[PDB]
Amino acid sequence: KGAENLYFQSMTPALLGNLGVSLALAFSLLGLGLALLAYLQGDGRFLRGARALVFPAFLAALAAFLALEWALLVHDFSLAYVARNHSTKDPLWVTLVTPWAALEGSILLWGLLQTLYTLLASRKPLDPWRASLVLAVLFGIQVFFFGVMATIASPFETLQNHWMMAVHPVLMYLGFVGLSVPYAYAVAAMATRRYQTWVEETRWWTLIAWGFLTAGKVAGMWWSYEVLGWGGYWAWDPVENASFIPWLLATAFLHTAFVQQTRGAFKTWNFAFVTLAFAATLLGTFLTRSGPVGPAFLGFFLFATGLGLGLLSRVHPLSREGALLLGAFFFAGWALVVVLGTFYPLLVEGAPFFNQVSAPLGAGILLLMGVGPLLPWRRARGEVLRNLLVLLLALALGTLFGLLRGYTLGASFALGLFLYNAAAIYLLAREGVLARWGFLANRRRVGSLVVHFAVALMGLAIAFSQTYRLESEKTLYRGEAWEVGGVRMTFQGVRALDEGRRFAVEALLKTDRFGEVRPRLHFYPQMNSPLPAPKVIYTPGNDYYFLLMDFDREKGEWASLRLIVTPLVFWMWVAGGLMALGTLYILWP
Ligand SMILES: CCCCCCCCCCCCCCCCCCCC(=O)O[C@H](COC(=O)CCCCCCCCCCCCCC)COP(=O)(O)OCCN
Ligand SMILES: CCCCCCCCCCCCCCCCCCCC(=O)O[C@H](COC(=O)CCCCCCCCCCCCCC)COP(=O)(O)OCCN
Numbered sequence: 001k002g003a004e005n006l007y008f009q010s011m012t013p014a015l016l017g018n019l020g021v022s023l024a025l026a027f028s029l030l031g032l033g034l035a036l037l038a039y040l041q042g043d044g045r046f047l048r049g050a051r052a053l054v055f056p057a058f059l060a061a062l063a064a065f066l067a068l069e070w071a072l073l074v075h076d077f078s079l080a081y082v083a084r085n086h087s088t089k090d091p092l093w094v095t096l097v098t099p100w101a102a103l104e105g106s107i108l109l110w111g112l113l114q115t116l117y118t119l120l121a122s123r124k125p126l127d128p129w130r131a132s133l134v135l136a137v138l139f140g141i142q143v144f145f146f147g148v149m150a151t152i153a154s155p156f157e158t159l160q161n162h163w164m165m166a167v168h169p170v171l172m173y174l175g176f177v178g179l180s181v182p183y184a185y186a187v188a189a190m191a192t193r194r195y196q197t198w199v200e201e202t203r204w205w206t207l208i209a210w211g212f213l214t215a216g217k218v219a220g221m222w223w224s225y226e227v228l229g230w231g232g233y234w235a236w237d238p239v240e241n242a243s244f245i246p247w248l249l250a251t252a253f254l255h256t257a258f259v260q261q262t263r264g265a266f267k268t269w270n271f272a273f274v275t276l277a278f279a280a281t282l283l284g285t286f287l288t289r290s291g292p293v294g295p296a297f298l299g300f301f302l303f304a305t306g307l308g309l310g311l312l313s314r315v316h317p318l319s320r321e322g323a324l325l326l327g328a329f330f331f332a333g334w335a336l337v338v339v340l341g342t343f344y345p346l347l348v349e350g351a352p353f354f355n356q357v358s359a360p361l362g363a364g365i366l367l368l369m370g371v372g373p374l375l376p377w378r379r380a381r382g383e384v385l386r387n388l389l390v391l392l393l394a395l396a397l398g399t400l401f402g403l404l405r406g407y408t409l410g411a412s413f414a415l416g417l418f419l420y421n422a423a424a425i426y427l428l429a430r431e432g433v434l435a436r437w438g439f440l441a442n443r444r445r446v447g448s449l450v451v452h453f454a455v456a457l458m459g460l461a462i463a464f465s466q467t468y469r470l471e472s473e474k475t476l477y478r479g480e481a482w483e484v485g486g487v488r489m490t491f492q493g494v495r496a497l498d499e500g501r502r503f504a505v506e507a508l509l510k511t512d513r514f515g516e517v518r519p520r521l522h523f524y525p526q527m528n529s530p531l532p533a534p535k536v537i538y539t540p541g542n543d544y545y546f547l548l549m550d551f552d553r554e555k556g557e558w559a560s561l562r563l564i565v566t567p568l569v570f571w572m573w574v575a576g577g578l579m580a581l582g583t584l585y586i587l588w589p
């Protein structure tokens with residue numbers, strides 16, 4: 001005897017993914033080390049090395065993600081993540097969106113999109129001092145994700161019915177990694193002492209990151225109204241408005257970046273806003289719609305904010321700059337009030353607060369958005385071209401045009417604000433196209449105008465739906481109450497339908513002539529979760545309107561109903577569509 005008998009360890013998805021996250025951690029660790037030596041002692045052979053490791057770090061990250069997709073497709077049940085997330089396992093589209101379903105797979109997809117964005121920024125045309133430092137901080141973020149994926153929270157150990165629970169996560173993860181690369185440049189810029197050049201080289205990641213943020217927030221609104229179906233587009237609970245804080249700051253930052261992009265002004269506020277917006281997007285992406293991983297993310301957040309504002313610490317009035325800076329102050333003040341209100345029950349040792357703070361601040365940004373671009377750059381005082389009458393005229397028109405109907409001073413003043421805003425969009429377009437010719441060539445101005453108008457339409461829609469909504473909860477056998485809000489319904493039974501994993505039950509209703517005839521709102525005894533009854537609502541859109549139909553409890557042989565009535569919520573989503581087809585127009589169609 002005495003001749004050894006070797007075996008392989010057979011190549012699982014498990015050890016492919018383990019070599020994936022470990023090899024990615026190794027590549028990103030030595031990328032952070034070679035980038036830091038490249039800044040400190042100034043040698044070119046280390047800025048070559050950190051730029052050499054961007055492609056292998058992303059490749060090992062892709063190996064780990066494709067190992068998780070591999071395991072989810074081959075129906076290996078030995079790993080903990082797949083055995084706990086193939087308790088919703090069968091269809092093809094949900095097996096490909098299970099690799100970010102719970103926590104560990106989602107931080108794998110998060111670190112993957114980080115590595116992809118670092119790869120796409122690694123071919124930078126950037127001078128080597130802050131090239132070494134952007135690689136240092138971006139490899140640090142990758143090292144945090146794969147460290148927090150490797151020592152804690154590993155995917156490779158041993159629920160619903162809608163697709164937006166797939167695509168609302170990635171929309172923010174993309175958004176975060178977009179706001180990664182300006183922040184990197186900023187923490188580079190304040191250390192490389194070149195304070196203006198950083199934001200005009202990084203501008204498209206800032207716009208695209210904010211576009212992914214705005215599509216995420218509007219998509220979460222639509223999904224919470226129509227598919228999660230608790231009769232509302234917005235929640236002020238500490239999970240939901242925590243994805244409202246980053247979107248606010250990434251908006252203020254977008255406007256300040258544009259100012260210095262065109263003027264070299266507020267580089268101080270730009271550094272502040274990209275640091276605050278980036279760490280905000282971190283803590284918003286960690287705590288979206290869903291132990292000791294929270295401590296690691298809290299330490300990472302503290303590190304990010306402390307680093308950016310520490311390096312900023314070591315380093316006109318009535319104009320378009322003043323209007324944009326006051327608007328960015330309004331955005332930052334709004335995020336400040338939402339954070340200061342969220343922790344105001346925490347730090348002592350509701351929805352009326354947030355609504356009553358949001359309506360004046362929303363009125364202020366909807367006013368400033370109209371008045372700002374109609375101002376010239378760096379003016380002393382508003383004495384010459386006071387065009388502000390006709391805007392005020394439109395403003396005044398809308399208020400009386402609403403006040404001479406039912407509309408309360410909130411709703412009628414919001415009508416005045418939208419009419420003032422469409423007036424400003426026309427005044428901007430008229431004073432733009434008068435140069436004579438295709439104004440559509442100037443993609444920033446015309447796409448921004450479409451985007452500005454789209455928010456204008458949402459301010460009207462939100463104030464009209466917030467003011468004018470009625471809910472009624474009834475219980476009908478073949479009727480108890482029939483007319484609510486313009487159409488009379490009646491009860492016609494329950495059906496049972498089996499489509500799968502969930503059994504569905506029905507309330508079939510009836511309406512006359514052009515009232516929506518025979519509708520069918522839904523309910524699930526959904527077997528997978530602790531036998532709960534969640535609803536999915538049915539809703540007719542109308543020419544002025546949206547009508548939401550709810551089940552509440554379907555009882556044993558008689559059932560209940562809820563019907564809520566809101567105005568202009570469909571026009572809120574046509575405004576969301578207008579924002580999508582405008583921010584795409586800032587890019588190339
Ligand atoms: C010019 C600017 C350039 C700057 C670029 C540099 C960037 C560097 C990268 C930044 C990363 C920041 C990471 C800070 C987070 C640390 C937070 C610690 C978390 C923690 O202690 O968790 C506890 C222990 O868990 C545990 O059991 C241990 C968990 C440890 C997780 C750590 C994850 C590793 C992340 C990699 C960090 C980077 C390393 C540096 C190369 C909780 O549990 P408990 O004990 O309280 O339970 C209670 C029972 N009593
Ligand atoms: C319903 C599902 C929802 C899924 C949403 C998917 C989003 C659609 C993606 C469309 C684009 C995909 C194909 C185009 C490939 C383009 C890659 C290069 C992009 C690029 O070069 O842009 C740089 C910026 O990068 C950037 O700003 C970031 C580029 C990243 C593109 C978006 C990545 C999406 C990844 C999602 C994968 C899952 C989809 C699988 C079906 C330019 O910068 P610059 O240097 O020129 O600026 C200089 C300033 N002076």
Ligand SMILES: CCCCCCCCCCCCCCCCCCCC(=O)O[C@H](COC(=O)CCCCCCCCCCCCCC)COP(=O)(O)OCCN
Pocket residue numbers: 171204208211212215580583584587588589
């Ligand atoms: C699946 C759901 C996703 C919905 C998206 C709907 C539209 C899908 C297709 C988008 C195609 C847009 C054009 C893609 C071109 C990719 C090729 C790269 C070309 C390139 O590098 O040019 C850049 C354009 O930005 C870019 O690279 C554009 C990247 C494309 C992603 C942009 C979408 C994010 C914003 C819209 C939000 C809606 C998302 C809804 C989920 C920079 O320009 P430059 O070099 O000329 O700069 C200097 C001037 N000074």
Ligand SMILES: CCCCCCCCCCCCCCCCCCCC(=O)O[C@H](COC(=O)CCCCCCCCCCCCCC)COP(=O)(O)OCCN
Pocket residue numbers: 355356358359360362363365366409410411413414455458459462463466467
């Ligand atoms: C200088 C030369 C002289 C010119 C003259 C100067 C005149 C200045 C005029 C400017 C005055 C600004 C006044 C703004 C008041 C807010 C009106 C809208 C409020 C509203 O929505 O209706 C409320 C009820 O809505 C509700 O119950 C829930 C509302 C939820 C908040 C609404 C969110 C709106 C956000 C809009 C989004 C904008 C786009 C964001 C990107 C009314 O109820 P109330 O009377 O009880 O209120 C009392 C709070 N103290």
Ligand code: HEM
Pocket residue numbers: 207251254255258323324326327328365366368369370372373444445447448449451452454455579583586
């Ligand atoms: C605080 C009030 C606001 C003011 C004064 C304002 C002003 C401006 C200005 C001057 C521009 C440059 C193009 C132009 O001159 O039209 C611009 C661009 C833009 N704005 Fe606004 N804005 C405001 C609020 C908002 C809001 C609420 C949104 C969100 C819908 C928004 C989204 C955008 C976008 C996406 C661009 C294009 C930026 C680019 O990629 O170049 N702004 N804004």
Ligand SMILES: CCCCCCCCCCCCO[C@@H]1O[C@H](CO)[C@@H](O[C@H]2O[C@H](CO)[C@@H](O)[C@H](O)[C@H]2O)[C@H](O)[C@H]1O
Pocket residue numbers: 217230231232233234235236351352355358455458462466471
């Ligand atoms: C482009 C992005 C811009 C986004 C702008 C949005 C900022 C302002 C947010 C306004 C919306 C807040 O609206 C919020 O809606 C929810 C859900 O409908 C309301 O919640 C409501 O739901 C229940 C449902 O039973 C009702 O019985 C109850 O009377 C009421 O509280 C909140 O009380 C209100 O605060």
Ligand SMILES: CCCCCCCCCCCCO[C@@H]1O[C@H](CO)[C@@H](O[C@H]2O[C@H](CO)[C@@H](O)[C@H](O)[C@H]2O)[C@H](O)[C@H]1O
Pocket residue numbers: 403404405406407408409
């Ligand atoms: C010198 C003053 C200058 C300001 C000019 C104001 C113009 C005058 C506008 C008054 C017209 C509004 O008239 C009003 O209309 C509708 C029609 O049913 C009803 O509507 C009323 O209901 C609600 C009840 O909460 C009020 O909040 C609302 O503001 C009001 O419009 C009132 O019964 C009637 O008083």
